Structure formats: C-alpha cells, structure tokens
C-alpha cells in the first residue's frame, strides 16, 4: 500500500520491444531488453542499462555471432544479486540451411560489468544437420569364411542396401583379405543403383585377415571425392569381420585415429563362434565407435545375420532420425533455447520449449561441457505440443535448490511440474494441472519464501487467459508439499479486480520481498491488459501461515501514471534497493516505457489518554442552587507516539510528519456533559508537527456541576489523520501511515 505513484521515474527510448523484459541489477541499475529493435541487418534485439541517478538508458555492447541472425535478443532475462551476473537470451536465431531453416536460442552470461564480453551459452550453436549419407561396407574375405556363408553375407549387404535406400543414398563395398578389393564405388552405385547387380557377381577372396589396413584403404581410397563421396555427408562404415586380425603389418592403433579424423562412424557385425569368448568381443569394441553396445552386436552364424539387419536398420536410421518416419519429431532442434531463463547456483539454465515436437525441455549448463537436459518421464503423444519450460523458476528446500516448470498447452490445458535431483538424476517430484481450457495455466511461475526460512513455502502459478465473466486472469496459490508424498495441491486462488475480462491477470509475477515491514514477503502480479491494454499491477501482502492475502492492498493503474502508457505490468522485477534509501524498490515494464516505483516508509501511531483526576469524586452533585457553571480543575494528559514499522538505511533523524487531532466529549448524546476550556462546545481540532519521539500535551476540560445522576462514564474520542512530510533528500519521498492502523481512540472517565 506504500508504493510511491506521484514521484515515479519513467525511462523511455525509441526501440521496438523496450519494456518486454525487466530485471533489477544490484548496483542501482535496471536492465531492459528491446527484442524487436533492428540495430543492424541480420540482427534483431538489443539491451539497455537504465540507472536511477542518470535518468536515461544506455545501449549494451552486442558481441553477436554472424549466424545469430534475427536473434530477438532481450526476450528473456535473469540476474543474481549476490554474485553480480546477467543472463540475456535471444531465442529466435535463424539458421537458413539448404532446404530448411531452424529457430534456436543463444544466451549471454555477463558479470559485474558490460564491456567484458560474456560466456556464450551454448558456446557452439547446434548447427546444420548434415545432408545425405555415404555408407561404405568392408567385408571379410578370409578363407575362414565358408562359401555358403559368404553368399549369406552378400545377401545381408544387398538387403540392407535395399532397406537403407530411402532417398539420396550412395553405397560402396570393399572386400578385405591379404589384399583389398574395390568392387563398387559411390559413383558406380550412383550410375547403377541396383545393389544385387553390383553384389551378385562378386567372388570370394581367400587368405589372411588384414583388418587394419582394410580400414585404412576405406578411409583413403573408398572415401574419396574422386570415387563419388560427397562432402559434408554422413560417413558410415559397416565392417563385417570374423574378428581375428592376422598377419596385418598395421595395428589398430594406427588406422582407427585416422578413421576418426575423417568422421567415419564405424559399425561392426561380429559373426560366428569366434566371439563366445569375451576377449574376442572386446576386439570388436576396439574397431567400432563408442559406445560399443550401440555399434557392436554378435551373431552365432551367418544365417543369424538376418536377425541384426532388422535392428541395424533402426540403428543406422537413428542418426538421421529415431522412430521418425514422416512428420519428424524434431529433438533439440527447433528448440528456442533460453526462451525462459534462470540462473541456478550451480550453472545457468535455459529452456528448450521446442524440444521433442514442442513438448518442452530444460537445459542446465552447470559447467557447459556437460549439459543436463530435463523433460518428464512419459514419452507419448499426450506430452507433444505442451511448450514446457515457458515459465521456469527455482525453489529452495532448506537452501538446496530444485526446479519447477510450466507447460501451458498440455492437451490445451495448463500444466506445472516440479523437479528435484537424486544423486545426479533429475526426476519429476509432482505435477499440477489447470482446469480452464485455454487459460494458459503456468505461463508465469513465482516461488515465494514468506518467512525467508531458506525454505520455499509457495509457488505462484499464473493463468493469465482464464476468462470468468468480468474477471480476466487468475493466479493459483500452490504451496509445496511438506513431504508426506501427497500430490501437489493448490490451497488458494488470487483474482484481479472485476471489470476487465481481457485484463490478463497473472501474465508477469515477481517477488519484491518485504515492503511494509511485516517480516513477511510480499508479491506483485501484473495485469497488462486491463483498461483496454492500459495495464495495472496489484500488490498482495504475505500472511502468517505461509499464504498470500486473498485481497490485494494496492492497485496501481497505468492510466493514472501517464496517459500514454500501454501494457503496464508486462514485466516485473523486485527485491533490491536501487535508490540507496533502504527502501525496497520495484520496477515495472510497459510498451516503450519502463518505470520504477519506490517504497515509502510505514509509520504507526500510539495514543495514550491518561487523567490523574480519573476519580469521579462526585462533589458536584451537591449544588447550592446558585448559577451553575463549569467549575473545578480539569487535568488531562494526551501523549502521541509515532514509530517506524519499517527498517531503512536512512539516518532516521529526518522523519517529520503532520498529524491532526479531533477530540469529542460525550458523543452520541444530544447535549454533552463536558466542554473544553476555549471552544465552549463539545468539539476540538488541533494540528501539530511530530517527530518520532512522544509529544504530550495537557488540556483543560470543564464539567457543569449539577447534571443527570451518574450512570454513564464520560468518553473522550480521538480520530486523527497523518500526512508525513517528504524528505529533503531521497527525492521528496513521503512516509505513509499503515493501512490497518487504528484511527479511533476512546478515553475512560467514570461517573
């Protein structure tokens, strides 16, 4: 109830999108993103730094990569107060590969200052998927291979080539013996794309198994652009071996590193009784790419080559796509990384909303070399098109951190799930679903520690598109489970003011901490669609018992601040002092305008009304029938003490305030039984400027002698009104009396 509205400080700059993301830095600065500003061609979005002292904003240096094209930098922001950091993401980088474009994300982890170029997240963009595949075969032609099985191996190759030629595939084959035998190149397959025509006339070589040199000639002679291999294609080699290298002058130490520098992915089919021993199977693991379990399988005889070719088709398809078919389920591509961002203590996190056909997912770059990707357990069509990670927030469970996620489109109903880690394994602790279809439940998330325990007591879930007649949004009060394994259950619900059905209450949420000095954390909720998109911000106090008050305390409409404001409350950021006045400030974002609201110190008034002649003494009821006037002394003491309900780093010696006394005697009766010294009626009004020390004033009452017989005691009521004088420094900031302050005081004087 104590946010200064009249002396608000508004920032403005001509850049499309300025106000669409705000974040309070520690050092008296507000960082705002302008995601739609065209600073240069093939770049979009910029960032600005707004200081409280210098009322203008300054641009931020942009170390944008060349293929971070049309980035929309500044759509998502996050910062940490205790280590000075800034996480700025543009989640719309366009990679226009041949025949497809992709939308991805890129972030920047600034530090204490801004000319130091930050840590890029991710350091490497995921990149263009390679186009078309060059598949080579290397088949054993030792004398160990019996002639009937040799034709089984040829039929294996022919059927797999028939199965793998979906479109635009080139194939090659080289037998391998004592000497090595190029039967057909990729170019020769392109001119005659009949696998059986190329494979059937081949005759079996005989002799010693020179596996290592055969791998070398595949890399050199067979994977060569003069023989039809295509640049930037997938290079796959399938080696079919009896698995016992004999007589080869080269070891595996030589040809395998040169196979890896050319990027040749190696599959091994190990055939026969040779690999019933584990030692021979480890030699198969040496040939193939890592991990061996995916790339190595063992068949007991060449007739069992038919068994692996069913699964090997799926395993080789997996590089292009796993169980994809048509209408491919795009995974870690189309992701839009950093769509929602947050900085975990371990490392910066950033959400991939477009992961697994927009089912949603969250990256966790704790060291950036390991990426901890986190979506949910069930893999089904139900989870598709959920946009999970659209609001990402962290909770504190005894100062150990966990994660909460928002999927506003789970079967066109919102969904919010919690995650915690178990010895490096991030599992879904619980989930909460919405009920209003299209309410966008979970578009905004906000974790609230009411008592500042270090234990998050409450997660605020916003459903800004919930339509309930006059109401135009909803915020769900969802406390964290204590640990009785009860499913996560939302105890209460917060609405906005009635009258704006398209008001979007709950589109942006923040924690501003304690503003009124009640030791309980207060929250703000923005409604940037109210009053026909001239938005508003509501303030809700915390409650003892770790809840949020169902009725708001202060509604700040964007119409009253400036006539040319729009979407007031689309971006919120609180919890830090920006004016160095010890007052918890609060920044609000709007279209084209960003404005900060300063918190006013709260005062409370204590009234003590004490009479030394509180005794009735009843002398007056013996009047000697003379002319009756108010007689006898009237000692009165009226002390008022005003104290601070808020702690600030002000000096606190300059807290002046003006209070107005109104006094009434025997109110509620037609004529009173008492009058004052001066007015000669039953009314008194005094004004007096008061500090924070008790100022006490003695008065004189007058009692007429013979009155009605003593039944009712005399009362002295006091109503008052406090206007704090603004401070000479600190931008004329006015102390305000508490909303729940008692403003009536009755005194007792018996009859």
């Amino acid at each position, epitope marked *: 109830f104590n946010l200064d509205t009249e002396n608000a400080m508004t920032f403005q700059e001509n850049a499309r999108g300025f106000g669409q993301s705000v974040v309070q830095l520690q050092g008296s600065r507000v960082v705002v993103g302008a995601p739609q500003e065209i600073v240069a061609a093939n770049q979009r979005g910029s960032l600005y730094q707004c200081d409280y002292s210098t009322g203008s904003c300054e641009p931020i240096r942009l170390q944008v990569p060349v293929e971070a094209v049309n980035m929309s930098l500044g759509l998502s922001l996050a910062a940490t107060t205790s280590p000075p950091q800034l996480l700025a993401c543009g989640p719309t980088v366009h990679q226009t590969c041949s025949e497809n474009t992709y939308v991805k994300g890129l972030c920047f982890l600034f530090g204490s200052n801004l000319r130091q170029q930050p840590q890029k997240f991710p350091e490497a963009l995921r990149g263009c998927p390679q186009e078309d595949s060059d598949i080579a075969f290397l088949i054993d032609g030792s004398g160990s291979i019996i002639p009937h099985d040799f034709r089984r191996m040829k039929e294996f190759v022919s059927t797999v080539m028939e199965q793998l030629k979906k479109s635009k595939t080139l194939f090659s084959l080289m037998q391998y013996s004592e000497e090595f*035998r190029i039967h*057909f190149t990729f170019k020769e397959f392109q001119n005659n794309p009949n696998p059986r025509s190329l494979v059937k*006339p081949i*005759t*079996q*070589l*005989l002799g010693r198994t020179h596996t290592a040199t055969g791998i070398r000639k595949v890399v050199r002679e067979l994977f060569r652009i003069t023989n039809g291999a295509r640049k930037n294609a997938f290079k796959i080699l399938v080696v079919i071996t009896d698995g016992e290298k004999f007589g080869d002058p080269l070891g595996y130490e030589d040809v395998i590193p040169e196979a890896d520098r050319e990027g040749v992915i190696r599959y091994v089919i190990g055939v026969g009784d040779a690999f019933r021993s584990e030692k021979s199977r480890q030699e198969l693991n040496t040939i193939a790419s890592k991990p061996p379990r995916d790339h190595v399988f063992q068949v007991n005889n060449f007739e069992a080559l038919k068994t692996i070719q069913n699964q090997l088709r799926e395993k080789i398809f997996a590089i292009e796509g796993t169980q994809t078919g048509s209408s491919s389920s795009f995974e870690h591509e189309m992701s839009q990384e950093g769509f929602s961002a947050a900085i975990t203590s371990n490392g910066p996190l950033l959400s991939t909303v477009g992961s697994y056909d927009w089912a949603g997912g969250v990256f966790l770059y704790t060291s950036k070399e390991k990426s901890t990707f986190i979506n949910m357990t069930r893999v089904d069509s139900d989870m598709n098109d959920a946009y999970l990670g659209y609001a990402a927030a962290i909770i504190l469970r005894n100062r150990v951190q966990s994660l909460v996620l928002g999927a506003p489109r789970y079967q066109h109903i919102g969904l919010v799930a919690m995650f915690r880690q178990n010895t490096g394994m991030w599992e879904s602790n619980a989930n909460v679903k919405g009920t209003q279809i299209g309410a966008y439940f979970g578009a905004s998330l906000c974790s609230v520690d009411v008592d500042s325990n270090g234990s998050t007591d409450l997660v605020l879930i916003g459903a800004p598109h919930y339509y309930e007649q006059t109401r135009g949004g909803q915020v769900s009060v969802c406390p964290l489970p204590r640990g009785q394994r009860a499913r996560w259950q939302c105890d209460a619900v917060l609405y906005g003011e009635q009258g704006q059905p398209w008001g979007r209450f709950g589109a942006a949420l923040t924690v501003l901490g304690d503003v009124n000095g009640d030791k309980l954390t207060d929250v703000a909720i923005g409604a940037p669609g109210e009053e026909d998109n001239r938005g508003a911000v509501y303030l809700f106090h915390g409650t003892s018992g770790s809840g949020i008050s169902p009725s708001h305390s202060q509604r700040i409409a964007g119409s009253k601040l400036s006539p040319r404001l729009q979407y007031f409350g689309q971006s919120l950021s609180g919890g830090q002092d920006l004016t160095m006045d010890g007052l918890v400030d609060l920044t609000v974002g709007a279209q084209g305008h960003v404005l900060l609201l300063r918190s006013q110190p709260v005062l409370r008034v204590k009234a003590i009304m004490e009479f030394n002649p509180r005794e009735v003494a009843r002398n007056v009821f013996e009047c000697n029938d003379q002319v009756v006037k108010g007689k006898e002394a009237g000692e009165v003491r009226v002390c008022l003490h005003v104290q601070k309900s808020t702690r600030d780093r002000l000096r606190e010696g300059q807290i002046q305030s003006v209070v107005t006394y109104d006094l009434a005697l025997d109110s509620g009766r037609p004529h009173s039984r008492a009058v004052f010294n001066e007015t000669k009626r039953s009314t008194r009004r005094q004004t007096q400027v008061l500090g924070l020390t008790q100022t006490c004033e003695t008065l004189k009452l007058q009692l007429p002698n013979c009155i009605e017989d003593p039944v009712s005691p005399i009362v002295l009521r006091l109503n008052f009104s406090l206007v704090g004088t603004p401070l000479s420094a600190f931008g004329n900031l006015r102390p305000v009396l508490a909303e729940d302050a008692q403003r009536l005081f009755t005194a007792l004087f018996p009859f």
Partner: nanobody
Amino acid sequence: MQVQLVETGGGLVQAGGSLRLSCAASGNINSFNAMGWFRQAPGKQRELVAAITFGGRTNYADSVKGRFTISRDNTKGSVYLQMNSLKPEDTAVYYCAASENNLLTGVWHYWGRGTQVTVSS
C-alpha cells in the same frame, strides 16, 4: 559366373629373343581375382611358371626367374607375360589361368585354350 580367356601373343621366336604374351578376360573384373600363366611342354603336364595376385604380388618358378616378368593392368582386365632371353627348353603351349579366389596355388578353374610358343635353336 561366366569368364572367358583368350591368349594373344604366341608364335615362333628365335633363341635369345623375346616375346610378350597377353590375355583379356571376357567378363566382370569383380568375378575373378588371381591370374597366372601355365606352360605345357611336349610329354609334360601343365607347369605354373608365373602367377600374380590382384594387388600385384608375384611368384615365379625357378626355371624362369630373372627372365620372365608377369604384370597386369586391372583397368583393362588383362595380365601380361614378358619373356626375355628365350631358350629352346621354353617351347610349350602357354595357358593363362584365372581364379575366382585370390590364392596363387589354388582353384584355377578358368583356363584359356592356350597359344603355341616355339623357340628355335
């Protein structure tokens, strides 16, 4: 598999002279690997005097070492026998042979019909 062998180069040659034998294989180069030359002198059986693998490893009989050279051109499907310092004891019908497999001493199923080389004293 169908492979046909034809010998080209035989004839009459003086002692101390030289002669080159050649042969093309009528079929798929993928359908045969090892090639060799035999000779059959009068009264005698077919003697392997020079054989070559597909990659060019050679073996020679001791009676022709230092005088005969076997060579091949896989781009033409051909193998050659350059016979230098010819002697009357080299008079024979010379055959070319080819194998489906790549061994120098095994399964010489494909045979040419042979060509006569007669060396006069």
